[PDB]
Amino acid sequence: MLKQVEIFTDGSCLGNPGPGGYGAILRYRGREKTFSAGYTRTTNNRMALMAAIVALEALKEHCEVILSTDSQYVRQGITQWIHNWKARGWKTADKKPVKNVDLWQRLDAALGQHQIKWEWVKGHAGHPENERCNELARAAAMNPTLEDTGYQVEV
Ligand SMILES: [Mn+2]
Numbered sequence: 001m002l003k004q005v006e007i008f009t010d011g012s013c014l015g016n017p018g019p020g021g022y023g024a025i026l027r028y029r030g031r032e033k034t035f036s037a038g039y040t041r042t043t044n045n046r047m048a049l050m051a052a053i054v055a056l057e058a059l060k061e062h063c064e065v066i067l068s069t070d071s072q073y074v075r076q077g078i079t080q081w082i083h084n085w086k087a088r089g090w091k092t093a094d095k096k097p098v099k100n101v102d103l104w105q106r107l108d109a110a111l112g113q114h115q116i117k118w119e120w121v122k123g124h125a126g127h128p129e130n131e132r133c134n135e136l137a138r139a140a141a142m143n144p145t146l147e148d149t150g151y152q153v154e155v
Helices: 044-057 072-086 101-111 128-141
Strands: 004-013 018-028 031-042 064-069 115-120
Touching: 004 044, 004 128, 018 044, 018 128, 031 044, 031 128, 044 064, 044 072, 044 101, 044 128, 072 101, 072 115
Parallel strands: 004 064, 064 115
Antiparallel strands: 004 018, 018 031
């Protein structure tokens, strides 16, 4: 009846923009899979989206996902803009390209693959997993090996 999985995520960036990284943990009945990658020039918002995107796309079957993130930006996108974006060809109020459309569309595609249960956490603090994701994100940010291809300007 759909395996239940828990995903923890964290995006971290040394600047705005600047080197950044994402950290994600996927827990299933005890065991977990780690995901991390560093980029030379990106933003915290994009890394936060990427963390979720990567964890979700790694699932090979429909699952019930409890997705935890401390990103206020992802929370706002998910809870207040995603709906209208799709129902509008991904354009703002006065018909204009939405910021980070490349990652939001990719996330939306992965979210539609599962039964999602978002968990809006307030920072790492007392969440072992998210704290762990932050560590991985920072570590990747300090040793970036990829370019955030979908990032240009508009900041
Ligand atoms: Mn964080």
